[model samples]
Target: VNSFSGYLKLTDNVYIKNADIVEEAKKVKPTVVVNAANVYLKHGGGVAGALNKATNNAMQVESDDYIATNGPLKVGGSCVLSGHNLAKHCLHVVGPNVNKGEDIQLLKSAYENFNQHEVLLAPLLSAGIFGADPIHSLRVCVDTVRTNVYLAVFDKNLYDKLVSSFL
Candidate 1:
């Protein structure tokens, strides 16, 4: 393993096994969990919807506001949605939206345009709503984070799905 100054590198992202999402929303905690959210926070499907539920629909207000003003979000652009129940803050990025690999562009853009750092965890990008090919999309998300990460999955089905896609 590589080390920087006898310490672990934050950029060398690691996964915390038997866990699901370490939300970076630390107003109180030292760690930071970035939310890979859609600006719409459409909880009907996909990762965004799940998080929206988790935050008790906390992100909806802001994301909706952004949508109302901006029309549709640019695929590469992102913003922070104040967290609710679980997360205190989340980084909302636009999903590719279309079925299959429509989000291929979003994945590429997310890592390129996204802000950085700390105690991070993320999920398969919009596989539910976007019909993104899970394995391919996750591979990209993992590669792009530029750091070690703790991917927190709750359901075994999700685990299976992600593993199948990932492997």
Candidate 2:
């Protein structure tokens, strides 16, 4: 197993841990797994692909409900899709789309669109597939979620850096 560490924040009841994305998703037991998606809710590749595979492609039929009306959720917008295994919702946003060249600012804005929930888990975001810097992805979530939250980081070094800031 790879050596890793997790950081905790008592004030907001937040925890940042570095581990496997799928495992972390389980630990966090979040209501939503925000997917940085395009207007089509395409899961052909990237993090979406990972999630799609994990859910046994349930997203394909369920996502159609989200895509119908509020599509083109654009660079900074977000829409909630269905979820499973404790993640009851999947918040879809087109943060790092080729259309906008996956701009960092737009990616950050996507985080801002998430609805209030007691618990939420996010991947390194556009980092895995959209190709944006992983640290920047964390920063956006940090900026967005100020109230009690729990987060998981998939990178060990990055988790340490986030820990230092909390210290």
Candidate 3:
């Protein structure tokens, strides 16, 4: 009864919730949502693709335009973009590719990039295809953000890890 389950209140304003980011991005409409994007800002798969789909491909079109104008986003870099559907805005951050030896600093920067916002909805950036270890990504994510955060987690294993490790 005392164990963590669906949620964990990490701090007064920070929280870990077992939920889908796309669904919550629409449902909660927080100040901004983070996209675990690639250097090219391609929203073709994973969270990026999902958000692109959720926003009716507007996110993709804008992302393409961004790439064309600004070149690829470097690892540990970010950019803000207009939102669609029920979301107000999106924060696109390029996470490190661990296979290429990109380290924690990049992932940390990915999350830290969103610290300027008052309220945020973010995923465990780089923990997916970018290949950062999930728990390591979670640690960096929790440590970097100073703003109010609702850490959206979808994987059951990750949810359990969040409870077991953080609790």
Candidate numbers, best lDDT first, in rank order: 3, 2, 1
User: What lDDT does the true structure give each of the candidates?
Assistant: 0.53, 0.63, 0.80
Candidate 2 residue lDDT tens string, 97-120: 533465677776676665455556
* Cα error of candidate 1 at position 130, Å: 1.0
- The per-residue C-alpha lDDT of model 1 at residue 114 equals 37
What's the alpha carbon RMSD for model 2? 4.9
Each model's Cα RMSD: 5.7, 4.9, 4.0
Per-residue CA lDDT of candidate 1, range 34-129, in tens? 555554545454456556665666567767776787766566566655555555456666657556445476776765433365544455455565
Stretches of candidate 2 exceeding 4 Å from the true structure: 1-7, 10-14, 97-100, 157-167
Count the clashes in each prediction.
17, 0, 0
Worst 10 residues of 2 by lDDT: 1-10
Could you tell which candidate, 2 or 3, scores higher by TM-score? 3
Query: By TM-score, highest first, what's the ranking?
Result: 3, 2, 1
For residues 1-167, write the lDDT of model 3, one tens digit per residue. 22223557877666788888898877767668888888898898888998999888999998899889999988999989987774678888888988778876788878878788887788878877778788888777777878877788888777877768852
TM-score per candidate, in order?
A: 0.66, 0.73, 0.90
The most accurate candidate by lDDT is 3
Error of 3 at 62 (Å): 0.9
